[PDB]
């Protein structure tokens, strides 16, 4: 077996699957969704293990859904802050504080592709996400497939 903390510390597809059949619930349960920064962190760590393979894709998508549903459904959760910090951590928007933008945006983009199609997703965030995913950026250009996919999906929101 595995635990959520160990998974978040050193994310891997295998560790996610080892969390068990209820991994999605556990990731959400163990994340302090009252803090947008922590939600961005969990979202990116979970999405970092995305692989276009049945079991992993499902595990990542389910975890993203449980986490974001829990975060977004709180009337006190600032969805705009979440989006801003997500863009900052993805290296698409600058910030006043120093952050270590992730190296690979493939997983995050594929996770977002799934997220924006869910009922819990605040549609008001779609235009902002679209603006920053379409904006020129080397990291995004390296993940053309995932980028084009997410944009095509955003056009349908």
């Amino acid at each position: 077996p595995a635990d959520v903390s160990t998974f978040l510390a050193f994310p891997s597809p295998e560790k996610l699957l080892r969390l068990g059949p209820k991994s999605s619930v556990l990731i959400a349960q163990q994340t302090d969704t009252s803090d947008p920064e922590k939600v961005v962190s969990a979202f990116l760590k979970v999405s970092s293990v995305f692989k276009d393979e049945a079991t992993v894709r499902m595990a990542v998508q389910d975890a993203v859904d449980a986490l974001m549903q829990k975060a977004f459904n709180s009337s006190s959760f600032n969805s705009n802050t979440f989006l801003t910090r997500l863009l900052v951590h993805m290296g698409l928007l600058k910030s006043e504080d120093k952050v270590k933008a992730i190296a690979n945006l493939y997983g995050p983009l594929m996770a977002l592709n799934h997220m924006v199609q869910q009922d819990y997703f605040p549609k008001a965030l779609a235009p902002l996400l679209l603006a920053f995913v379409t904006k020129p950026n080397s990291a995004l250009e390296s993940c053309s497939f995932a980028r084009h996919s997410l944009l095509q999906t955003l056009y349908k929101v």
């Binding site: 705009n80 989006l83 801003t84 863009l87 928007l93 600058k94 006043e96 235009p127 902002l128 679209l130 603006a131 920053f132």
Partner: protein
Amino acid sequence: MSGIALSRLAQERKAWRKDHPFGFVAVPTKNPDGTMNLMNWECAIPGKKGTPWEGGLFKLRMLFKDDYPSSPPKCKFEPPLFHPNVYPSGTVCLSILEEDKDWRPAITIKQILLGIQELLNEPNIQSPAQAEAYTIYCQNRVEYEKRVRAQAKKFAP
């Protein structure tokens, strides 16, 4: 150990008081004991005539660090403004306000305030500081200008 910063700031205050652009305000705040706090200035920038910012008076605080002028002052609109290059915190971005960019001793308070005034109607769309204003500017210019005019009227003296 801010003696060097204070020496320069005292001269900048005298220079500003002697001559500055009409409509602009830049005055040191006061310490509890009544003396001037040259490290914290309350300023105001008038919208440029002929632009959607006309009529508005935008207040900002200029904060100087102890190592000034090796470092540029931190400029923050109070309250924060709707503009692509102004962070939600109110901090405004300019190349001349970045130590690793164009900040140099030759830069004056007049140059900074005039630079920020110019930035108002001529944003740097390539380097946004907020997702909101950037998104609207790029997706609906007419709507963006409408929001700018409303904000200018809101802050009209």
